[PDB]
Ligand binder design. Structure first.
Ligand SMILES: O=c1ccn([C@@H]2O[C@H](COP(=O)(O)OP(=O)(O)OP(=O)(O)O)[C@@H](O)[C@H]2O)c(=O)[nH]1
Ligand SMILES: O=c1ccn([C@@H]2O[C@H](COP(=O)(O)OP(=O)(O)OP(=O)(O)O)[C@@H](O)[C@H]2O)c(=O)[nH]1
Ligand SMILES: O=c1ccn([C@@H]2O[C@H](COP(=O)(O)OP(=O)(O)OP(=O)(O)O)[C@@H](O)[C@H]2O)c(=O)[nH]1
Ligand SMILES: O=c1ccn([C@@H]2O[C@H](COP(=O)(O)OP(=O)(O)OP(=O)(O)O)[C@@H](O)[C@H]2O)c(=O)[nH]1
Ligand SMILES: O=c1ccn([C@@H]2O[C@H](COP(=O)(O)OP(=O)(O)OP(=O)(O)O)[C@@H](O)[C@H]2O)c(=O)[nH]1
Ligand SMILES: O=c1ccn([C@@H]2O[C@H](COP(=O)(O)OP(=O)(O)OP(=O)(O)O)[C@@H](O)[C@H]2O)c(=O)[nH]1
Ligand SMILES: [Mg+2]
Ligand SMILES: [Mg+2]
Ligand SMILES: [Mg+2]
Ligand SMILES: [Mg+2]
Lengths: 219, 213, 198, 213, 214, 217
């Protein structure tokens, strides 16, 4: 079926050929398992770096967001140019445009759409519009934690939880599933799989629940 | 300065030639009084009708939203055509497009942008992007009340309050988030009084002013 | 081959395929409201076109995964969207005509030999509310039509007739209630009126 | 006041610089006198040669039309490029696009829009959309006659007539339908005389004026 | 395999249906053998008819270029319209658009993109962007000779050469050469009269000059 | 009259708030002096980083260029966004689009257009299309030298042919081949200067200051 893959921005800040090489194989691996793949790429450091520079000279919040969006699109193009042929050569700039590009039956790579949200929201929207039952959020963490492994000791990894639990835990910045994202995944009952992009090579396993991952169930 | 005017959908469901006429005279006042007006029109009943009909046959939530957006755009075109020669002849379909159309120095009429939100959000976004310090929400009510007068007795009208007060109580999430971060004040008023919009803005005529916090 | 299906607007008020949807009551509801405040004729037409497109989206969205997700706004755009090999739903294109004309244009551009006009009547008559003409020609229809404008056009307006004739496209007028019985109407003779180009 | 100027295709076949020269002049003069000018250029011989050639190898009628449209656009670009800095640098490809380009307040040059009609229809549509009360059709003849003036001797020019008078005889069906419903008067004149365009418009120079009815 | 076909402007001036008839035939041949084909059409005489006229009244060099581009696009439409159902119905106006239109898997016909270059450069760019290892330049002459064959008894066609041997010497501008070299695209110069023997040309069983990148 | 200002990519790599400001200034100055300004922003390090990352996994040369172009547009947006309502809110992606955006009478900010060239070429094209008689190339250097600075001196006046003799996604040049070809045929003079002096742009333009003026020939 259809599946949306949200690649965290950090993924591009790293500068190591192996990242793209592996993401590319996994996009193929997912393909050879009868999977249509949509990919959303975040802005990463390029985004933050420009948002800061822009903010420094007083650029309004709306425009700071656009800069982050454009930065996320630059990453989108990078992913796409390595997916060449395999992907539809256009980076939709709105959900409506995505819906169109998705018609062509190839992989579609997206960046941001609108100010006031994050690529997480985009991933949700795109997942909903593409009838994807699963939204994989590949980030630099292994999964979801009750508090924060960085600041609290032995906060064991929650391999399963609902949009309710994730709400209490979370109870241009973000989260991982900002408000709009959660709202969308819930109304369209899309399950979110948080995993480490280091394991994109074991995505097929992740999807069928055989590897370190956190699955958020809609409720 | 710049100002955004959010016209509730009900405004178009009434079909009384006087609504468009009055709205048309007011956009002209604001204009001949040093304002650049941006207008956001809601889907109204057309939106609901199509959403209803579409839902009935199982159209996904994303697509029901698109239908409401297109309906809101149809109202956008209606408002735009009557103001001809005061408005830029294009209904932007995204904030990015709005920003572009706004460059032309004329009135810009908009409908929805993206699924998952309401024209309220669009009005906020558009207000923020156009550096509008005030977002006027023209609806079928006089303003904000501590609880709806429909059900509680002796509910007067809050002539002033802040985002926090409004919290304790249309403005969807994104709208509030935007008006707060960019400190945009929202003026809730009755579209029946668009002929007194200049007064409203300077705090006279009956209205509820939501202050950002 | 290819076939174009023109869905009358009333439909919403209640083999490759191209679909054209009319504005219906939404179109006329706006057209009268717009006219009331003096909106020019060109713009009234645009309102009708937008209304027709709104219907186009509704139809498109329901056929999802069968239709190319874009509503062309001009013949040139249609030709392009048609390249993708999926169903294409269209609304109006230009002022001064009706979706009928669009259907014809679209039929011609797509090399469709048949244009099916599904309306709120079983076929072509001679007058409305009288017998049903089960088989006529572009000339007979042109005559059955006559003079005595955003909102109201004739079954097949001037441009539609001109197009169907020059490209020899046969027009099948039916009842959208029998849309389901299209494989037969089309190829049968059932309760349909077939207009032969001449 | 807005005014639409339809330049006959022949204008470009003469490979006459003198024609483009006088056009710029009049566009410049019209602008001066407070007129917004929309220009529609026909396909001319280029359109002819291409359609001919295309037809020869069996291209469909729809596509032959598109080729004439493209050829009319090529002329549109030529006129535009010469009007540079006075014209909006884009040749709209549909009435909807024209409406948009016209918002920018500069001269807009157009070619064809859709198959099945002629630039005359385009001129009419564009005139209607831009609220022009006059559509000037500039051809290689001083005006309307009852028979061709170059062949028939003793043909007198008809200075005034009606849409019907014309029917009872340069204007395709759509064009006439449009000029009538929107009551646009059409002035047929010789493009050799465009520089005297200001006189033509005020009934103080040779020309045929078709009154809508 | 992807391949780009550059049709010289003269091709359209003969008002030769003969030419179009054979182009359409070889596209079919190419499609029928699993070749994706991108086509670039030059402005030909139409281009110079409009440029000459424009220059006459002082239109700037940038705009003269645009006129030639539009002229080449008009030819692009003509070729496209005859390929109907075999080609994507849009004439990209920039390399970025071409890349997009090419995604659709059908034949793409192009004209010019930007001022300051020729369709040759467009053909090279498009070849590079579409990963075509071969760029066929169909001219009205069998290939490249040692001495001009126009008026020079039979001379002798040189079957092999390099982009360097090309420099040591129309239909080839600076950008074109830079591109074919950096992306190592081989260029085949051949007569458009022979465009249906195109399958042979490509494999060496037919007359032509092959420029090797270096 | 019109003038095109080419901002070197390094200008954005310094990530200095001041950089953006002084620009926003000169524009207002230049503007307030009967000058319409077109601005072309290069890709800088962002472009370069992507061009190398992309190349590492084998992305073709055409696509590496596109990445550079998009990176240069990102800078274009940044510059545009900082120029409040002074600039037309759209980053043209082709000369044809530039010509259109330029009609609106406001500042237009551009990035790349097409593979195979550099923003220098874009600046030249844009200058020619906009009838600009002068193309200002603001780089981090002070002007031109027959050898990049060491110990060499600054050639205050040379010709495009002088530059030729004096003179791959990434590969720079001051003026690449297309740029020179364009500036020559349309006789556009190019003023090479240090972007540190954007503030003194009005002086530069009238000869009074540290700059190298390349005369077309
Ligand atoms: O649709 C969008 C996307 C992004 N943005 C803006 O750009 C920025 C990029 O937001 P992202 O959510 O793309 O950042 P990221 O990729 O680094 O996130 P993680 O992978 O670390 O989870 C955000 O901070 C926001 O301001 C929008 O405004 N809208
Ligand atoms: O940006 C938008 C706008 C609208 N919509 C969708 O279309 C519908 C129309 O959005 P409205 O905001 O017009 O809804 P409403 O009709 O209740 O508004 P008012 O009476 O208060 O004016 C909403 O119900 C929403 O689902 C979007 O999804 N996104
Ligand atoms: O190409 C087009 C299509 C439509 N329109 C405008 O849209 C409006 C709707 O005209 P339609 O012909 O689309 O309406 P309908 O669906 O009710 O028609 P029937 O099938 O019942 O006969 C008309 O008033 C017309 O002005 C155009 O101007 N141009
Ligand atoms: O909107 C349009 C315009 C033009 N065309 C097609 O292109 C051709 C050009 O139509 P024109 O009306 O421009 O022809 P022309 O140049 O000979 O006209 P004059 O001003 O010289 O009298 C026509 O023959 C028609 O087929 C369209 O299909 N649609
Ligand atoms: O990308 C382009 C293509 C073309 N042009 C401009 O348009 C004209 C037509 O471009 P051509 O490529 O047809 O010129 P040419 O005369 O060398 O062509 P062939 O006989 O080899 O087919 C050229 O003279 C050029 O000025 C551009 O500016 N850019
Ligand atoms: O039109 C364009 C512009 C840029 N590019 C691509 O963008 C990349 C950046 O080329 P730039 O010329 O934008 O770099 P820069 O701004 O840092 O240059 P200087 O002013 O310091 O000399 C180059 O690698 C090139 O391939 C294009 O391909 N086309
Ligand atoms: Mg609502
Ligand atoms: Mg009708
Ligand atoms: Mg004609
Ligand atoms: Mg460089």
């Amino acid at each position: 079926m259809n599946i949306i893959l949200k690649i965290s921005g950090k993924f591009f800040d790293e500068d190591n050929v192996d990242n793209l090489i592996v993401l590319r194989q996994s996009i193929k691996e997912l393909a050879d398992n009868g999977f249509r793949v949509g990919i959303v790429t975040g802005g990463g450091s390029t985004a933050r770096r420009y948002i800061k520079l822009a903010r420094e000279i007083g650029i309004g919040e709306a425009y700071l967001d656009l800069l982050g969006i454009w930065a996320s699109r630059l990453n989108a193009y990078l992913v796409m140019f390595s997916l060449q042929d395999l992907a539809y050569m256009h980076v939709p700039q709105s959900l409506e445009e995505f819906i169109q590009d998705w018609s062509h039956g190839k992989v579609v790579v997206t960046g941001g759409f609108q100010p006031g949200q994050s690529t997480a929201a985009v991933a949700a929207l795109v997942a909903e519009a593409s009838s994807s039952k699963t939204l994989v959020v590949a980030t630099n963490v292994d999964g979801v934690y009750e508090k924060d492994p960085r600041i609290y000791a032995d906060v064991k990894l929650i391999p399963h939880l609902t949009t309710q639990d994730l709400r209490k835990i979370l109870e241009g910045t973000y989260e991982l599933l900002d408000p709009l994202a959660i709202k969308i995944v819930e109304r369209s009952k899309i399950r979110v799989i948080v995993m480490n992009y280091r394991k994109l090579n074991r995505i097929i396993d992740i999807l069928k629940g055989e590897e370190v991952s956190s699955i958020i169930e809609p409720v």
